[PDB]
Amino acid sequence: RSRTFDSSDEVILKPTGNQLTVEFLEENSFSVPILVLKKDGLGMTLPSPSFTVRDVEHYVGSKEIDVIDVTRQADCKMKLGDFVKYYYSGKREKVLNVISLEFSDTRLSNLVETPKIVRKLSWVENLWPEECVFERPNVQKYCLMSVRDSYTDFHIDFGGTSVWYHVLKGEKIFYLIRPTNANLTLFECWSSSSNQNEMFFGDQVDKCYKCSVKQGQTLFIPTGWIHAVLTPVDCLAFGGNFLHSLNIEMQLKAYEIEKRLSFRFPNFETICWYVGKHILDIFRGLRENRRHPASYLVHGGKALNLAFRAWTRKEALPDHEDEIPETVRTVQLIKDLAREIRLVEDIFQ
Template identity: 60%
Template sequence: MAAVPLYCVCRQPYDVSRFMIECDICKDWFHGSCVQVEEHLAVDIDVYHCPNCNPVHGPSLMKKRNNWHRHDYTEPDDGSKPVQAGTPVFVKELQNRTFASADEILLRMKGEHVTPRYLERHGFNYPIMITEMEGLGLKLPPSTFSVKDVEQYVGGDKIVDVIDVARQADSKMKLSEFIKYFTKLHRPKVLNLISLEFSDTKMSEFVEVPDVAQKMSWVENYWPDDSFFPKPFVQKYCLMGVKDSYTDFHIDFGGTSVWYHVLWGEKIFYLIKPTSANLALYEAWSSSPNQSEVFFGDKVDKCYKCVIPQGTTLLIPTGWIHAVLTSQDCMAFGGNFLHNLNIDMQLRCYEMERRLKTPDLFKFPYFEAICWYVAKNLLELLKELREDNCPPPTYIVDGVKALISALKTWLKREVNEPTSEVPDNIRPNHLIKELTKEIRYLEEEPVSGSKPMKSQGSGCGVGPGSNSSARRLREQQRHAPKVPSNLDILEQHTREVLKRLEVGPLEEDPAFCAKVHGKLNKVSTASAAAAAESLEDNHLRLMLVNGRIIREAVQHQRRLQGDKSPMDSQGNSSSEAWDNQGLPSPLSRSHATSPETEYQYCDPSMSPPLHPSKRHAPNPPPVSNQATKGKRPKKGMATAKQRLGKILKLNSRQSRVFV
C-alpha cells in the first residue's frame, strides 16, 4: 500500500475541511492555523514564505493596494471602472443616498398584537416593526451580552463562515479567531458574521423565538420526529457585524420569512416589494456578470430605507428583496421560517434559486421534503374542513394549488435528476391525486349556504398551533339539543325497560319479594301511561314480544274486530300487566294463535331463549337505510332491540322466566 502524503509542519495528511496555503519557494503545503495565516488574510499575500523558507528568503510579500472601490484592490485605478458593492467607497456613497421612507410600507405594532390569528385575517405582506416586546414571546439575553459570551456558550473551536465585506467573499475561520478580530481596536478588514446557527449549543437556552414564528413554522409543526432527513435548524441565528458591514440585495433562502432583533448597535435595511416585475428584475440582476457594479435599488421604482435601532424587532414577509448595512458595531438575533400564508411565493423563490444555481450552502435545507410533509398535512386539513362543512380560506386553497403544480414538476424532474427528497412514508402520486380531488370538490361542489372566502382570514382556524373553529363547530353540534325522532323514543323506552329489568337475584324472603314486586308494578303502571301519551303524539305504538317489536297496528286491528284485551283489577291492559316474577307478560301468551304475530311459546325449562340475531325467518332484518344496507353493525353499536334481547336472555337464566 502506498504511503499517504503528509503535509505541513504537523506532518498530517491533507484535510479538505481545513484551510491550507502553499509556499511559493519550497512548494510545500501548510495548514493556515499551524503557520498563523488566516484564510481571509491569505488573499492579501502576494508571495508566501513558509516558516522553513522564511529565514533564508525573508518574510512574505504582501499585495499592493491600488484602489478602494473594487473587490480586487490590486487593479490599477484609472477611474473608468465602476464602484463595486461592499467596498469602502460604496459604503460611503450608500450612506449619502436618499431613499423613500419605510413608513410608507411599515406596520408598527405591539408585540401582543402580532399573532398567527392576526396574520391569517389580515395577511403577512408587509414588514412589521415591533418596539414593545411584551406579548411577542421573544426571549433574549440582556443587552450586556457580549461577543465573548457568544464564544463561551457556543465554543471557540466552532468553524464559522465569515464575509469579507470589501471583497463580498466568504471564508472560514474559528469563532475564537473572529471574536479576537471583533474585539481589536484596529481592524484591517471589515468582516461580517451572519450565519451562526446556534440551536444545538448552550446559547440556545438564552433565546426563544417569537410565538408567531414558532406557531406558524412548517418545521416546528409539520416535520416528523422519525424523518429520514435531518431536521433543518434555521430558527436561531446570531449575527455579529462591525461598523460598515454590508450584505447586498438578496431574498432569504426558500422565500422564508424572517424575524430580526437588534440586541445592541444598529442596522439599516433597504427593502423592495416582491412584485412580479421586481422579482423578474432581481433574477436578471442576480445572473448578470456585472451584478456587483449595479446597485439594485436603482433598477426598481422604490427602495425603502428602514432603520432598526437597539431593542427593536423586525418581521420581514416572504420574498421581500433587501440589503443590510451595519451602521455601528452590532449584535442581532434572528431566524427564518416557512408558513402557510404565502406558499406560492415561497415556491417561486425556491424555483428562482434553482434557476440561478444557488449553492446548497445558501438554500433552505431539504426544502422539497418539507413541502411533501406539508402537502400531506394540508390534505388532512382540507378533508376535515369539508366534513365540517367549513370552507378553507383563500390562502390555503391557493397554496395547495401551487403545491400541486410544484410537486408534479419535481416528480417529472426525478427522471433526469434522481435527487429525490420524497419521504419514504409518502406515496407521491396518490398524494397529488387526493389533493387535486379536494380542490375539485371546492371548485365544482361548493359548500351549500357558504360564501367563497375573499379575504386572508377565515371563519375556520387552520393555522398550525391555532384553535380550530372547525373543532369548535363540531363541539357545538355535538352538544346542541336534538329533536327526538321515532327511533329516539324507541331507544328511550328500551332503556327504561332495561333499567327495570336490571335487578339482582331476589332473596327467598317472601315478604321482601312481594315488596319488590309491588314497586315494580307501580313503576310499570306509571311508565306505561307516560309512554302511551308520548307514543300517541309520535304515531308510534310499540310492544315487545320475545325480543320482537310488534306494532300497535295489530292490536288496533283486533280492537276493531271486537277482540279487546281484558283489563286487570288495577285498570291495566293485560299486555301491560306484570307476572308473578316482576316481568311484563307478553300479549302473545293469550293470543298465541294469532297469525299476525307468528309467535310460538316454548317452555324456558326445556330450551334456552335465542338471541334475536340467532332466531329464524319470522324475525325481520334490522332496519337500515341506504348508507347501512348490507353492512353489519360496527362493534359496540348493536341495536337497542339486540341489547334488550341479550338482557332478557341473561335474566331468564337467573330467574327462570322467559319473555
C-alpha cells in the same frame, strides 16, 4: 455613504407584540415587513442588553464559524476566538461579518427563544416528523455579529423563508424591495448578470424602502422580499428563518428563483411534501365538518399541487426523487389534493 430612499413608515406595519398574532397575519397575508419597537408580547426569551459578543464566545466555544469578508467579497472559515479578537480590536483592518452562525445545537441554544408567532407558523417546528431519513432543517436560531460599515448586497433569503431579526446591541439598516413579478424579474436578471457586484439594484425598481432596526427592536421580513443590509454601528443581533402556509406560491416562486440562479434551505421540497399531506388532512377534516377553508390555503394548496406535478414529471423526476419521503405516495397525494380543491371550488356544491 448611502443615497435617498422611500418612506418605510408608509408600508411597514408597526403593531405591538400582542397584536402580532396568526389572525393578524391571516388578514393581511403577511405581505409587508413588520417592525415591533418593543419586544413585550412577542414570546421571546433573550439575554440582557448588557450581553456582549464576548458573552457569546463563552457559550458557543472557540467551534469554527463561517465569516464573510465584505472588503474583498469573499467567504472563509475562522475560529470564533479570533473573530472576537478582531471584533474588539481598536484598529480594525478588514470589514468582517458573521451572518451564518447557526447555534441551536450549542450551549447558547437555551439562552434564546424565538418569537411565539414564528413557532406557531413554522413548518419545520410543527410538521417535520420525528422519524425520517432526512436531517431536520435547523435555520431557526442565528447569532449575527456585524461591524461598522458591514454590508450585504440585495438578496432573497434561502428557500423563500421569512425572517425574524432582533437587534440586541447597535443598529441595522434594511433596504427593502417588494417581490412583485416585475421586481422579481428585474432581480433574477440582475443576479445572474455578469459583474453583478458592480450595479446597484435599488435604482432599478419603483420603490426601495429604508428601515432602521435599533436596540430592542424586532423586524419580521415576509417571503421573497429583496433586501440589502447596512450596519452603521457595531451590531449584535439574533434572528432566524422559517416557512409557513400564508404565501405558499411566493415561497415556491422564491425557492425556484435560487434554483435557476444556482446558502440553501436543506430539504425544502421534503418539507413541502409533508405539508401537502397535512393540507390534505385540513381539507378533508373541514369538508367533513361542513366548513370552508381559508382562501389563502386553497390558493397555496393549488400552488403546492402544481409544484408536486412539476417535480414528479418524467423529465424532472431524477432531480427531485431523492427529496420525496418514502412515507408519501406521490400520485395519490396529487390526486387527493386535487379532488379536495375541486370540491371546494365546484359551484354545484
